């Protein structure tokens, strides 16, 4: 299946905390991915014979910035790919990946940003999750903060991950308080707030843009993991999430037969559909990724082993596991990313190394 065809290491020797292929690449352009670590983001092109061609980095003016995360979208007018980055300074930067110019930046969290995700249908809706316990939804077309997901009934410690579902109607977040929380964004209130965000132009009005303050998740559980929950992804109506306890759990809110859209905020049950165990992944901030079609799931561990689960089976617990090791790959893997066509898998490590695996 996958063979390791190349690796390299970036000059800073600090952890690479994230990697993302650009799935908005144009037809016939080469496959491109971004790595984030130290105070930089770097872009690379994949070519034949395993070649990983260095392009150009964005390096923050602050030597104390530490980028943790990035996410791709495109300009909704021009179609050109854009790259969002954020980390310990709690500043989101929107980067033109061609020139690596910082086009604009957003401050709110003031506090470390642990993850960024873009809405699956609307390239302007960017979600950030913070060390300050909140999530925020931004509209990067009109430069507005649409809503803050917080309150004492929100997370009570750093939020580490979040994911929108397929249509972008709800978000599942998770973090250091051991919980997973659901926030619906297709409520009348949230749909109106999005609509109003698009109508906002500070040059044609006197008002500040009002953000929603969302203080009540639509569902919450602490019954999946018993430690920091550091990665979550929807799989249709089910959830995949992990902690630092050497398992990915496949679960859903409520009882086995309960529709996700009839779950009420007081729902006190969850249903466990399976659990994928693996070894030596006790440190936290270790993210799995899926391929475009959500046929598979890849995770690295803290000693440089990859696990890949084939989810193309009739029930989540029947997933088929493949492992990939290389004798020289021994550092902690923080994140993986598949190319859009699934032909390439990249893993990035705590020693600033980058590993390329082709089918």
């Amino acid at each position: 299946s996958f063979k390791c065809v190349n690796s390299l290491k970036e000059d800073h020797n600090q952890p690479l905390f994230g990697v993302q292929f650009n799935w908005h690449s144009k037809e016939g352009d080469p496959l491109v991915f971004a790595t984030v670590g130290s105070n930089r983001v770097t872009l690379y092109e994949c070519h034949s014979q395993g070649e990983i061609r260095l392009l150009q980095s964005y390096v923050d003016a602050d030597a104390d910035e530490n980028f943790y995360t990035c996410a791709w979208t495109y300009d909704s007018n021009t179609s050109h790919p854009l790259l969002a980055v954020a980390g310990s300074r709690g500043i989101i930067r929107i980067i033109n990946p061609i020139t690596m110019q910082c086009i604009k930046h957003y401050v709110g969290h003031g506090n470390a940003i642990n993850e960024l995700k873009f809405h699956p249908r609307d390239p302007n809706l960017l979600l950030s999750v913070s060390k300050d316990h909140a999530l925020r939804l931004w509209n990067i077309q009109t430069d507005t903060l649409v809503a803050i997901f917080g309150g004492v009934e929100g997370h009570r410690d750093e939020v580490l991950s979040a994911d929108y579902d397929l249509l972008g109607e709800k978000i599942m977040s998770c973090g250091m308080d051991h919980s997973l929380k659901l926030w619906r964004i297709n409520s009348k209130r949230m749909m109106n707030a999005i609509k109003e965000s698009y109508d906002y132009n500070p040059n044609k009005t006197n008002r500040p843009f009002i953000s929603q303050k969302i203080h009540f998740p639509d569902f919450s559980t602490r019954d999946i993991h018993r430690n920091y929950v550091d990665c979550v992804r929807w799989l249709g109506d089910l959830i995949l999430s992990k902690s630092c306890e050497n398992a990915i759990v496949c679960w859903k809110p409520g009882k086995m037969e309960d529709d996700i859209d009839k779950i009420k905020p007081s729902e006190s049950n969850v249903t466990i559909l399976g659990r994928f165990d693996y070894s030596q992944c006790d440190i936290w901030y270790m993210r799995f990724s899926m391929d475009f079609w959500q046929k598979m799931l890849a995770l690295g561990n803290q000693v440089g082993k990859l696990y890949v689960w084939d989810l193309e089976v009739e029930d989540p617990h029947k997933a088929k596991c493949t492992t990939l090791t290389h004798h020289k790959c021994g550092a902690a893997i923080r994140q993986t990313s598949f190319s859009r066509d699934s032909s390439i898998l990249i893993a990035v490590c705590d020693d600033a190394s980058i590993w390329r695996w082709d089918r």
Binding site: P15, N227, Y228, C244, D282, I283, W284, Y285, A332, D350
Partner: peptide, 6 residues
């Protein structure tokens, strides 16, 4: 639990 191996 730590973030990075010691």
């Amino acid at each position: 639990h730590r973030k990075v191996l010691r």
